[PDB]
Design a protein around this nucleic acid. Structure first.
Ligand SMILES: Nc1nc2c(ncn2[C@@H]2O[C@H](COP(=O)(O)OP(=O)(O)OP(=O)(O)O)[C@@H](O)[C@H]2O)c(=O)[nH]1
Length: 1073
RNA sequence: UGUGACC
């Protein structure tokens, strides 16, 4: 509830010269008071009359009404930022050392020195690409500095540490003035020219870093990173986070968690001695020297200190540095440089080929339907991303231009041009338009924006491999419904005094030109074997067209822009843009380690406890017959690196007996760690989401970081949200959304009023507002309807249908239509219409709901019904689980020490339902969890027509539709769909064991009725309420349920008429994918 | 229509 208040201290801070609180109430007479108070307030302000009287006069509204929004009327020239910044600029501005970076443009020169003219300029290399200004990030900081000016004791040491650092920014910024941004939140030439090219993005990186400073060690790390990061823009992060790969092999294991047969974490009190060959210490020092030579001082000592004893208890510092290294910003080079960096393989290609076979064998041998109708599968899965060229399109009586695949597939069909039989060339004659991938730390990488013919030809076969992966443990990233905790235990499992883990980063190998041949070759070779396993025209064709793209790509040409020119150079490496990218890379990376391990066995004899490939890393745990020694480690480590060398693969390969470090995670001292390097004030690229959407994503990013071990002051986060979600009515009148508006479970939710706890409307006003917002959730788009009606479209939707369905089916059909209408949202013009509407709507909205004939039910209502039939009473749970994830805040860790954690993802798509399994045996169609949710609630005879109308044979449709499974499915679909709506797999909850016995105790639910659905929700709602209470108070409570029998049937009905809510908060979570 | 693949 503090938002609404911290919101005023802010406005009254930014503006000095008025605020007009706007309330509302579900109660008619109180609302009319809410209306009167409003106007009376406007009036007095329109006369410079103190509102003090009215605030007393209408004290009733203040007290019993819900704050809807705070109106801010300010008449300043909005340069108050410039003015306000002086006070903090009394330190010596930083002077960029233009010597630290290789490429010249990476050095912090003046903009003009890099770009002499306005036609040569480009923010392309610094663009914060986010929808909030640098002025704001500035205002935010100062606002907070003022509020914690007179704080005492420790808060002061936090204020101080912070005030200091801000100066560095403030002073440096003041020297060249503050860079003003345009309506699109971009920094142009006129403003950037005189100022250092990287002033802005660095300011942003530095602000976000200093506002995440608390302890002295923080401050030390910030300050250091903030200074060097003003000159170094290319090796800092890599330099700072490089040591961590070795630090993990130095901490002894004193009690760890392993994985048991039930594939779940189980404590193991074992001790494993970290065995390290001297050479490693050399390597680690060489890394410490490099750290120093590049200016670093404070950070290198922290590690050197740590290295005396190397206590897993004093490892939180090392982890902290590793996570901070990333907040320096992204490394955005020039496409050209990004692209320029570019007989013993016999074994390595044989394995790749054998792996491509295993995966597709059965599907091929048994003329799988998916492999046959793969062309339809690709079409239905086609996204509305780029195709490469910017074609002119004819829709109805309108010719517009677009690059969208969905737009090009359509147009192409309506003109006999749709020809997937012909897989376009990608050579010198038809160069690949390029894309990029920017990440903090590593150098930029290019990306092939291949023609849609390439997706379609690969979609189905890729999916068939991913399935083989789903149940092959070696593929960590894909195995079962597993989260990272599982992979954590699979390693710590076989560890001991006679084994050694071998990890390897191979990101450089996959881009290496050496790989590109044995890679594409092994796949093709494999595809051949498969082709010889059938005669099915369908299979051979799609199996063949796959072989085709694996050739056109062998000798590929790329379109690198080199200025305002687009040179065509020859690309001889495997870039990524295909559908097989992730799968193939997984296949390849694993084929590799197998190749390496196989070779080193000629000398040393060991056993393979586990082999794994996960993203751009690949590791294995070997076991020897004798106790391992420093010398044994050195030898293995050498023969390995040497084996990799004989393949001309530039890769980092380490060998330890206690931990590992890979891009996704690292295991130090038997504990699990995940880098907390998600940037907040700078983004990789510009999407299409709105500001609100970005507000929510900021917050989301805050939560993930926080859980990972990097906390940005929440007061700062809330300030940014106050900024980003606002809506300007005129040049002076700006409207600010209230806490109720932004946190309630609506279509406009941005964040949770309290971290790790998701509330739902439990009061009338809350219900009122919730139902009001939903009413204006989806907006009209003239442009979207125009094409939604055009011929090529209807024909498109039609052609897809007649191809999928056998008999009639209106649910599918009505779906395919919308499913395709939505894709148009990637088209900017439409997107823009939408947002404009949403604003005006949500504009008048924050003024008077009322008229909204609610009739739709949501998870809120369901819960709000159940709420009153429970009795809480103080309970208690002892801490009985040792911590394995050190970084977790304290209130979230607690829940785990009491009820435990999980290593799987709760099924929330209805994929395990029998009916869904059925449809996938005879159909290429994929129904959402929300469709199955309705299809399962249909009259027995309707479900039978659905099934048949998708190619499901009667002996099957008729058999299922009756069976007991249909009933169990009925429950399973609902059970799955509800979890989906409660976000049981996100943020905080995904961590918890919702089936913990310890938890089950606190839940006392007398089953006065044998009606599964109701029993279900009652227990879950209770498990949630218990855990929330524990997440806030630190103590536990028990729940007793006295839900009526009569009511149960009333509820069960409500259950099957639930609507899914769509919001920025929701999408934010989906973005964490 | 300052936009730039897979997932
Ligand atoms: N290209 C690529 N991007 C990835 C990969 N894995 C994750 N990402 C990125 O992941 C960001 C998502 O971060 P998350 O995966 O949601 O962080 P998290 O993994 O959900 O934290 P949890 O897994 O507990 O463990 C996106 O912006 C992606 O670009 C990958 O293997 N390849």
């Amino acid at each position: 509830g503090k938002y609404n208040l911290i919101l005023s201290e802010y406005l009254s801070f930014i503006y000095n010269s008025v605020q007009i609180p706007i309330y509302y109430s579900s109660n008619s007479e109180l609302e009319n008071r809410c209306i009167e108070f409003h106007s009376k307030c406007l009036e007095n302000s329109k006369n410079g009359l103190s509102l003090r009287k009215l605030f007393v006069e209408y004290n009733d509204v203040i007290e019993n009404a819900t704050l809807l929004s705070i109106l801010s009327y300010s008449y300043d020239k909005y340069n108050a930022v410039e003015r306000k910044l002086v006070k903090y600029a009394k330190g010596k501005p930083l002077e960029a050392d233009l010597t630290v970076n290789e490429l010249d443009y990476e050095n912090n020169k003046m903009t003009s020195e890099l770009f002499p003219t306005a036609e040569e300029y480009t923010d392309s290399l610094m663009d914060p690409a986010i929808l909030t200004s640098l002025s704001s990030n500035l205002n935010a900081v100062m606002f907070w500095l003022e509020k914690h000016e007179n704080d005492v004791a420790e808060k002061l040491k936090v204020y101080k540490r912070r005030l200091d650092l801000f100066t560095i920014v403030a002073s440096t910024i003041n020297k060249y003035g503050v860079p003003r941004h345009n309506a699109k939140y971009r920094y142009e030439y006129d403003v950037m020219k005189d100022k250092p090219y990287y002033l802005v993005t660095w300011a942003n990186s530095s602000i976000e870093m200093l506002m995440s400073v608390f302890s002295h060690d923080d401050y030390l790390i910030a300050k250091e990173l903030i200074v060097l990061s003003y000159s170094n823009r290319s090796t800092l992060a890599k330099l700072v986070s490089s040591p961590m790969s070795i630090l993990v092999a130095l901490v002894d294991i004193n009690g760890t968690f392993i994985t048991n047969e039930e594939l779940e974490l189980e404590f193991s009190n074992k001790y494993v001695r970290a065995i390290v060959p001297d050479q490693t210490f050399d390597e680690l020092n060489q890394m410490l020297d490099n750290m120093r030579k590049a200016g670093l001082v404070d950070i290198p000592k922290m590690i050197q200190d740590w290295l005396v004893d190397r206590s897993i208890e004093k490892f939180p510092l090392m982890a902290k540095i590793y996570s901070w290294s990333f907040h320096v910003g992204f490394r955005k080079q020039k496409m050209l440089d990004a692209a320029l960096d570019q007989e013993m393989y016999r074994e390595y290609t044989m394995l790749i080929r054998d792996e491509v076979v295993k995966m597709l064998e059965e599907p091929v041998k048994h003329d799988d339907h998916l492999l046959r109708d793969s062309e339809l599968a690709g079409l239905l899965s086609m996204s509305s991303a780029s195709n490469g060229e910017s074609r002119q399109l004819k829709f109805g009586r309108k010719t517009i231009f677009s690059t969208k695949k969905n737009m090009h597939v359509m147009d192409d069909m309506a003109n006999e041009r749709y020809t997937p039989g012909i897989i376009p060339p990608v050579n010198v004659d038809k160069p690949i338009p390029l894309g990029r991938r920017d990440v903090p730390g590593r150098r930029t990488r290019i990306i092939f924006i291949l023609p849609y013919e390439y997706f379609i030809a690969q979609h189905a076969v890729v999916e068939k491999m991913l399935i083989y992966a789903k149940h092959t443990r070696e593929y960590a990233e894909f195995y079962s419904q597993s989260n990272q905790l599982l992979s954590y235990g699979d390693v710590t499992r076989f560890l001991s005094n006679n084994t050694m883990v071998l990890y390897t980063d191979v990101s450089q190998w996959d881009s290496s030109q050496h790989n590109t041949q044995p890679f594409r070759k092994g796949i093709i070779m494999g595809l051949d074997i498969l082709a010889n396993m059938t005669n099915d025209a369908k299979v051979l064709q799609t199996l063949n067209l796959y072989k085709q793209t694996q050739i056109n790509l062998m000798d590929s040409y790329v379109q690198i822009p080199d200025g305002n020119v687009i040179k065509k150079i020859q690309y001889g490496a495997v870039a990524s843009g295909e559908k097989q990218t992730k799968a193939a890379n997984s296949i390849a990376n694993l084929a590799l380690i197998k190749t390496v391990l196989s070779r080193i066995s000629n000398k040393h004899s060991f056993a393979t406890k586990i082999i794994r490939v996960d993203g751009d890393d690949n590791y294995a745990v070997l076991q020897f017959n004798t106790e391992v020694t420093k010398q044994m480690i050195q030898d293995v480590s050498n023969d390995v690196r040497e084996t990799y060398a004989r393949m001309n693969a530039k890769v980092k390969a380490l060998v330890s007996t206690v931990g590992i470090e890979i891009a996704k995670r690292y295991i130090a001292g038997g504990k699990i760690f995940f880098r907390a390097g998600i940037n907040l004030l700078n983004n990789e690229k510009r999407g299409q989401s709105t500001q609100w959407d970005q507000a929510a994503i900021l917050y989301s990013n805050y939560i993930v970081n926080r859980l990972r071990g990097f906390e940005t002051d929440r007061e700062f986060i809330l300030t940014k949200i106050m900024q980003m979600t606002s809506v300007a009515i005129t040049g002076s009148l700006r409207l600010f959304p209230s806490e109720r508006v932004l946190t309630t479970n609506s279509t406009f939710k941005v964040f949770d009023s309290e971290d790790f706890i998701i509330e739902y409307g439990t009061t009338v006003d809350e219900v009122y507002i919730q139902r009001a917002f939903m009413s204006l959730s989806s907006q009209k788009s003239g442009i979207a309807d125009e094409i939604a009606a055009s011929s090529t479209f209807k024909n498109y939707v039609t052609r897809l249908s007649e191809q999928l369905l056998f008999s009639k089916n209106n649910i599918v059909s009505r779906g395919i239509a919308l499913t395709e209408k939505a894709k148009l949202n990637s088209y900017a013009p439409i997107s823009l219409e939408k947002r404009r509407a949403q604003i005006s709507a949500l504009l008048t909205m924050l003024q008077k709901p009322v008229t909204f004939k609610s009739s739709k039910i949501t998870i809120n209502d369901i819960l709000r019904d159940i709420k009153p039939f429970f009795t809480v009473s103080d309970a208690h749970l002892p801490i009985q689980y040792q911590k394995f994830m050190p970084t977790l805040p304290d209130n979230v860790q607690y829940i785990i020490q009491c009820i435990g954690s999980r290593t799987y993802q709760i099924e929330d798509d209805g994929s395990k339902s029998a009916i869904s399994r059925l449809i996938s045996k005879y159909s290429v169609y994929k129904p959402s969890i929300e469709e199955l949710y309705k299809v399962i609630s249909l009259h027995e005879n309707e479900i039978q027509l659905y099934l048949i109308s998708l190619g499901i044979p009667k002996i099957d449709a008729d058999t299922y539709v009756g069976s007991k499974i249909y009933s169990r499915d009925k429950y399973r679909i609902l059970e799955s769909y509800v979890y989906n709506l409660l976000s049981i797999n996100y943020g905080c909850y995904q961590l918890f064991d919702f089936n913990s016995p310890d938890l089950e105790k606190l839940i006392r639910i007398p089953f006065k009725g044998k009606i599964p659905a109701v029993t279900f929700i009652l227990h879950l709602y209770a498990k949630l309420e218990v855990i929330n209470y524990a997440i806030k108070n630190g103590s536990w409570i028990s729940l007793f349920c006295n839900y009526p029998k009569s009511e149960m049937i009333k509820l069960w009905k409500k259950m099957w008429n639930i609507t899914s809510l769509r919001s920025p908060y929701t999408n934010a979570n989906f973005f964490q994918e």
